[PDB]
Structures are given as C-alpha cells and as structure tokens.
Scaffold this active site. Structure first.
Site, short mmCIF file in Angstrom:
data_model
loop_
_atom_site.label_atom_id
_atom_site.label_comp_id
_atom_site.label_asym_id
_atom_site.label_seq_id
_atom_site.Cartn_x
_atom_site.Cartn_y
_atom_site.Cartn_z
N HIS A 1 42.49 48.76 16.52
CA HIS A 1 41.14 49.43 17.38
C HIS A 1 39.67 49.81 16.75
CE1 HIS A 1 43.42 44.77 17.87
NE2 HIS A 1 43.60 45.74 18.87
N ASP B 1 35.26 51.36 11.40
CA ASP B 1 34.53 50.90 10.47
C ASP B 1 33.44 50.06 10.30
OD1 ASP B 1 34.36 50.01 7.46
OD2 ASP B 1 36.59 49.52 7.65
N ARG C 1 32.64 47.59 7.79
CA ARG C 1 33.16 45.94 7.81
C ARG C 1 32.87 45.40 8.37
NH1 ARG C 1 37.78 43.50 12.08
NH2 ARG C 1 35.61 45.11 13.00
N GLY D 1 42.09 35.98 15.73
CA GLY D 1 42.77 36.44 15.70
C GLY D 1 41.47 37.51 16.30
N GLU E 1 43.63 34.89 20.39
CA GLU E 1 44.38 35.89 20.26
C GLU E 1 45.57 36.12 20.74
OE1 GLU E 1 43.60 38.91 18.49
OE2 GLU E 1 45.53 39.63 19.21
N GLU F 1 48.27 29.20 16.13
CA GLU F 1 48.70 27.78 15.98
C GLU F 1 49.61 27.21 16.26
OE1 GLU F 1 49.89 31.00 14.89
OE2 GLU F 1 49.99 31.16 12.03
N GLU G 1 38.46 38.17 10.60
CA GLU G 1 39.17 39.32 10.13
C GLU G 1 40.11 39.23 10.31
OE1 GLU G 1 40.02 41.63 8.53
OE2 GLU G 1 39.16 43.42 10.01
N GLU H 1 50.69 42.46 5.99
CA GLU H 1 50.37 41.18 7.15
C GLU H 1 50.56 40.04 7.28
OE1 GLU H 1 47.50 43.09 10.51
OE2 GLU H 1 47.26 44.05 8.89
N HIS I 1 38.24 51.48 5.87
CA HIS I 1 39.47 51.58 6.57
C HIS I 1 41.29 51.07 5.51
CE1 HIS I 1 39.62 47.77 8.23
NE2 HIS I 1 41.32 47.71 8.27
#
Lengths: 337, 6, 333
Positions: free
Chosen positions: A19, A25, A28, A52, A74, A103, A117, A126, A279
C-alpha cells in the site's frame, strides 16, 4: 490450491509495504483522484462501489467528489485499516468499508458507478479484472459509470541499456582489476536473457527501438470480455526499427482511460517508458540472446496474455516473433515471483 | 516490487 | 535434508548476478586483491588453495602475487566459468580448477596458503566458515597462511533514517492527496518492526547512535573454532548514545583482516558501502533515547535449528532504565 492461493493473495495486501508503494506512486494515485473528479457530475449525490478498496483512499476521493454513498469492498485484512482511515476523515456515515470478496458482498442497492484499481504488472497479473467485471454485471445500474472505463496494451521492441551494461561488465573487469573475464559474457547472457520469466523493470525512451503499438484493448463494459480473458488477451504487432542496436526483446505496458465527463477530455493513466515512471514499470520479455538490428528492420509477432495453468493469478505471456530475415521463434514467459 | 506476488 | 540442502545452496552460486554483485563490489574486490598482492613475500613460489573459487578471480590474483600453483576448488557449476577464465588469462599451467565441495576434493598436495571469500550477511549467514576450517585442518601445511586471517564483529544502536521516512510516510499523505492517513503509522510500525527477521540494508554514519562496539573476534587458526560456531559466537556490549533520537534497534557488521605483508576490509556503515550492507535487528517499536542514554546487551550468532546455513541472532538488550528485553531473529529470505 484456491483456499491457499486466494487467501495468500489477499494476505499479501494485509501488509503495509504494497500500500505504501501504490500510494507513493503519485502518477497512479493522482490520476485516479483527477479521473474521479472529472466525473463529478455523474457522481455527485450518487452511489459508488469501490472494488478492492485497500486502505480506502479511492473511496474517499469519490466522497470528496460528492458521492452520497460509497461501498468500499476489500477482501484482505487491510479493510480494518481502511475503516479507521475513513473514520479519521469524517466519512464513515457515507463511506462503508465492507469486508470480503466482491463476488459475495451484498449491497443494499445497485450503484451508479464503480471505481477500481485492479491492474497488476503487465496489466493482468493478479487476474483481478474478472472480479470487477463480475461486480459490474451484478451491481452496476444500466448506463452506470466505470472508472477507469477501458485499458489498452502496448508493445515496443527494446535495447535495454542497463542489460547491455550488465552484459558488458565482464569485458570491463580487466581494466579494473587486471583479470580478463570477457569469456563470461555468453554465460551472463544465458542467465540474464535465457530464462522464461517476465521481468518488471523501468525503461526510458533511450531503450525504445521502434514506435510503440497498441496490440489489444479491453473495454470494460463489453459483455464478451470475461471469456476473452480466459482464452487470452493480445494480438499481432509489426514495427520498423529506428536505428542500429542490439535487440533484447520487447516491453509490454498499458494505459487505462477515465471518461472525460463534463470536460469532454478523457484522462489517460499511462505506464509507458515515454511517460513518468509508475510502480508498474514495464513488463520485459527478453529473447534468449541479443539480435542485431538496423534502421528499418521489420519486427513482427503476436503476444497473448493468459492466466497461468498452475496459478490463475499468475500472468503468462506467449510470444511469437520474427526479426528481419531470421526464422520465426517463440518464447513462453511467466511472471517472476 | 511485490504487488500481487502473494 | 542435508544433501538436497547443500545442492540447493551450491546452485544459488551458479547464476551470474551474485558473481557480478561480488566483483562489482569495488571495496571487497580491491581489498582482497591488495591483501593477496601485499602478501607476495609469503606467496612467491608457494602453493595456494582457493576455497570457493567462484569465477576464479582470487586465484588469478594469487598467481600475480607469485604463487607457483593454485588449486581453485568450487562446488557450484560456476567452476566451468572459472576454468575458462583461467585459460583466457594464460594460467592453466599453474591454476587448476577442481570441481566439488572442498570437504571431499582430492588435492594433489597440502598447501602453503588458503585464500577464501567465505563471508555471508551478518558474517556467518551461509555457514561457509566451517568449510574453510575443514580445508585448513585437512590441507594447510604447518605454519601456513590464511587470507584473511581473522574476522571481527561489531554492533551499534541505530536510528534508521529510511525506516523513519517509511513510518512517517502515512502522515504525509494528506499533503499529497488531501486524505489523512496518519492512523496507519502504528500498523506500519508493527509490519516493519514487529517481525523477527534480520533485515539486510545499508546504513550511513548518520544512522549510528553510539560508538560501535566490537563484541567478538574470530582468529580463524584458533583451536576449536568449529565447535564454537555450532554453540554460538558473540559477546556482551555496552555503549552511550550520542544524542536524542528514536532508537530502532541495532546494526551488526564485520571486518576481516589480512596479514600485513595489516589490511582491513570493513562492512561498517562508517566506511564505504559493500554488498554485505549491514544486518539490522529492529526492536518491535521505536524507543526514545537521549544523549548519554546507556544501552547494554548480548548478541549471539548461531545456526538456525531448521537450517544450519541460515543465520540466527539472539539479542538481549537493556535501554537506559527500561527492563531488559530479548528478541530472536532469523535471516530474511
């Protein structure tokens, strides 16, 4: 094993260092802040799902842009830190940090917008995109907003100046210490280029050997995109070299685009070596050894990004390529650990 | 270096 | 399992990047070069065993010092590269690369000198010293030369400026993006300090909070050194802090000394950086200290029970009038 793999993936986000890297970054993080703000008219007084949410920063940006309710979902234990960040900023009445995978979350309503993101190295490492697409189908209202809305993949052939220096090191030893080690060069080439791992490293324009080309695009609203991910995302490419150099392989990178909203000017977040470093750096596909090329040498091929058979969250890239008048070749890469 | 390496 | 573990260990040196890092370390490589070449009087016309010869560079220095013959023993597949290096330098007549572990190689003769670059992170990670000592017992002639001849271990309390920046990052987010994340600092501290891994990282003199203290000396010829390694090497220390700072823990480093023909290769943060960096032992969270705050403790370097080549460090420490504490660390992977 999925319980282990997915659990361990989420546990990697329960540590501070990732994190720190993402939030440090600025390219971003500011791109998201501004891309969210560009869409103030669609967001103000409306509802958002952050897929997320991590430490909650993007969900907070959405509230600061005027969102009425944000569901910050999350799956890693970092949700507990997000809960405290949200409260620290006076936002817990509006921004609701929800633990667990998107989900299986149950929101009290469909939402006007999704922000996420989800991009990994080489864009699809990922394999998070499927989670965003699942959330879009289940939770986004018809005509709702996706932030970002699309991704594009780019390739260029490269002559990696750092790699060249590392391979040339052995021929420099004699001037430094009086021992000739130039015979190490072939060995060094096999070790540094002959493996089959995708290498994450930062390049610059000085490494780019031909005009970059988009070789695929991912429009997130498209219904067929989930199955394309399973079959492989990518495409053919063809370019002509700027000049003479040892060709070391290819760099793959991506951009994502936020809709322009009221301004009618979309915001692009790029990971190109021609733009400020992020990053994500670039994903380097090295050939087994350098191949000399010259101005106007044609290089063509095909790149496919696939989930790995061993681990669905590990990016695999299948490369087919032809340099000039050389024979067609292939190389099969998997993301470095 | 270690995003999504989990 | 020992045979599979040793094979994996040797294999980790079969890749170019580690040899590049070692040879690109100008401090290390120039110190070994000069330590060997300044011993020309003792090596001229004599025989040498290079324990863990790698690419063969130190064996070539021994030839340049005048050695009549060098046996370069190397267990990793890199021995094939060393054989090519020797040939390229025209020395196949007097430098002989012999593959395999030094514990089982069949040398033609006992030798007048051993050279070896055997040091790991925290000096003893990898546990290669026992191999050099095995080779000394088996192959070094009476009164023979060992290069380097000794190693010394140092400790100092530290305030790691980089760790301080990383912990303080969360309080800087509001200035960059308008979101307050200062509440993350305690979580960041637990993550970055609360583990029990030895962290290899390079410090500067700015990070040293008291006069470094030598806590052990290893004379490599001394009898029984092998069994001491198994039981743990180390010692007690005491020091007084320079000024006010957050104490983050301790740094451990080493030097080795070559017979003078004395040349010292140091890995101290107060001296030029090397690829060994320093071995950092973080407390579970920062402790405020002031000028003349007394710090004492004991440090023991041991093989880890699970893996004899993995360094373990047992730390006992007392900061000022705080109660004595302990922490048990193992080398990060």
């Amino acid at each position: 094993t999925k319980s282990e793999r997915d659990q361990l993936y989420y546990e990697c986000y329960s540590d501070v260092s990732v994190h720190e890297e993402m939030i440090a970054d600025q390219v971003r993080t500011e791109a998201y802040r501004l891309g969210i703000l560009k869409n103030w008219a669609a967001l103000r007084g409306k509802t958002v799902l952050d897929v997320g949410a991590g430490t909650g920063i993007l969900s907070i940006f959405c509230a600061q842009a005027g969102a009425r309710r944000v569901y910050a979902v999350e799956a890693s234990a970092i949700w507990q830190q997000a809960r405290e960040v949200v409260r620290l900023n006076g936002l817990e009445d509006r921004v609701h940090v929800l633990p667990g995978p998107v989900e299986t979350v149950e929101l009290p309503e469909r939402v006007d917008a999704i922000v996420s993101e989800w991009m990994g190295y080489g864009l699809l490492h990922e394999s998070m995109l499927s989670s965003v697409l699942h959330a879009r189908t289940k939770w986004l209202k018809e005509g709702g907003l996706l932030l970002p809305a699309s991704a594009e993949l780019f390739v260029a052939p490269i002559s990696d100046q750092m790699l060249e220096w590392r391979l040339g090191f052995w021929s420099q030893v004699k001037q430094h210490y009086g021992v000739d080690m130039s015979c190490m060069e072939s060995f060094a080439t096999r070790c540094l280029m002959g493996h089959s791992e995708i290498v994450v490293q930062d390049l610059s324009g000085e490494d780019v050997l031909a005009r970059p080309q988009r070789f695929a695009q991912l429009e997130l609203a498209r219904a067929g995109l989930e199955q394309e991910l399973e079959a492989g995302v990518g495409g053919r490419f063809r370019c002509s070299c700027y000049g003479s150099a040892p060709l070391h392989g290819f760099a793959v990178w991506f951009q994502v685009t936020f809709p322009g909203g009221d301004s009618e000017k979309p915001l692009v977040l790029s990971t190109s070596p021609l733009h400020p470093a992020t990053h994500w750096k670039q994903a380097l596909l090295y050939l087994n050894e350098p191949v000399p090329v010259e101005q106007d040498t044609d290089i063509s091929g095909e790149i496919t990004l696939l989930p790995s058979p061993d681990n669905p969250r590990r990016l695999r890239i299948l490369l087919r390529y032809k340099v000039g008048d050389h024979e067609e070749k292939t190389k099969d890469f998997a993301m470095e650990d | 270096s270690g995003x999504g390496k989990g």
